[PDB]
Amino acid sequence: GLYFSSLDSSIDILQKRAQELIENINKSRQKDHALMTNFRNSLKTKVSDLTEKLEERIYQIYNDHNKIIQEKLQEFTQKMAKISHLETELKQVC
Amino acid sequence: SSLDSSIDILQKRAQELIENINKSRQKDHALMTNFRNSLKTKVSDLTEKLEERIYQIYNDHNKIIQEKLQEFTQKMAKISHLETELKQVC
Amino acid sequence: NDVSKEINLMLSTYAKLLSERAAVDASYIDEIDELFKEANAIENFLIQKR
Amino acid sequence: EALEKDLNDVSKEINLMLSTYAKLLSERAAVDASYIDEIDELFKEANAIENFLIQKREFLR
C-alpha cells in the first residue's frame, strides 16, 4: 500500500533525475563547444588584424624612405651635372 | 685633374650607395619572411598543445562519467530487485 | 611591445574559459555522486527491512 | 598543472620574439639613416665645389 508506492515514487524520481542529468550534459557540452569555438575563431581574426596594422606601418617607413632618397639623389644628380658643366668651361678657356 | 678626381669619387660613391641600398632592401625582405616563418610555426604549435590538453581533460572526465553512471544503474537494478522480492513475500 | 600585451592577455582569458568549463563538468560529476548517495540510503532501507 | 608550464613557455617566446624584432627595426632604421646622411655629405661636397666654380667663372667672366 503506502510502503511499496512511496518506494516506486522515489525510484521514478531518480529515474528522471538520472535522465534529466544526462540531457543536461549533452546540453552543457553544446555551450562548451559553441562558445569556445566562437572564441578560437574570434582570436584568430584579431591577431591577424593586428599584424596587418603593423605591416602597413612598416610600409609607411619604406615608402617614405625611398621617397626621400629618390628625391635627394635626383637633386644630387642635377648638382653633379652643373659642376661637370662648369669644369669643362674652365678647361677650354684657360 | 684634381676636380676630375673628386667628382669621380662623388659620382662613384653615389653608384656604390645605390647598390648598397638595394642590398639593405633585400635583407629587410629576408628578415620579414623569417619573422613570418617563426611566428607561423610558433602560434601553430601553441594551438595544438592547447587543443589536445582540453581534449584529454574531457577524455578523462567522459571515462569517469561513464563509470559512475554505469555503476549507478547497477545499484538501481538491485533496488528494484529487492523491492520485487518484498512485494512477493507480502 | 603592445602587441605582446594583447596576445598574452587573450591567452589568460582563453585559459579561464577552459578552467571554468572544466569546473562545470566537475560540478555535474558531483551531482552524480548526490544521486549515487540517495540510491544508497534506499538500498540500506530495503536491506534492513528484509 | 600541465597547462601552466606549456603557457609559461608561450609568453616567454613572444615577449622575447617581439623584443628582438623591436631591436631589429631600430637597427634597420639606423642603416637607412646612415645612407640618408651619406647622401647629404655627398651633396655638401658638391655644393662646396659648386661655389668654388661659380666664383671662379665670375672671376674670369
Author numbering:
A (entry chain A): 57 to 150
B (entry chain B): 61 to 150
C (entry chain D): 58 to 107
D (entry chain C): 51 to 111
Quote the authors verbatim:
We obtained an alternative crystal form of SYCE2-TEX12 ΔCtip core, which diffracted anisotropically to 3.33–6.00 Å resolution, and was solved by molecular replacement using a three-helical bundle of the 2:2 structure as a search model. This revealed a 4:4 structure in which two 2:2 complexes interact laterally, through tessellation of S-shaped SYCE2 dimers, to create a molecule of the same length (14 nm) but twice as wide (4 nm) as individual 2:2 complexes. The 2:2 crystal structure is largely retained by the two interacting 2:2 complexes (r.m.s. deviation = 1.91), which seamlessly generate an SYCE2 tetrameric core with staggered TEX12 chains arranged on opposing surfaces. In common with the 2:2 structure, S2C sequences were missing from electron density, meaning that pairs of truncated SYCE2 and TEX12 C-termini are juxtaposed at both ends of the 4:4 molecule. The observed tessellation of 2:2 complexes provides an enticing mechanism for assembly of a 4:4 complex from structurally intact obligate 2:2 molecules, in agreement with our biochemical findings. The 4:4 crystal structure lacks TEX12’s C-terminal tip, which is required for 4:4 assembly in solution, suggesting that this conformation was supported by the crystal lattice. We reasoned that the tessellating interface likely drives 4:4 assembly of the wild-type protein and is stabilised in solution by additional TEX12 Ctip interactions. The crystal lattice of the 4:4 structure is a fibrous array in which 4:4 molecules are arranged in end-to-end chains, with 1-nm gaps between juxtaposed C-termini, and a lateral stagger. Thus, the lateral tessellating interaction of 2:2 complexes within the 4:4 crystal structure describes the underlying architecture of the wild-type 4:4 assembly.
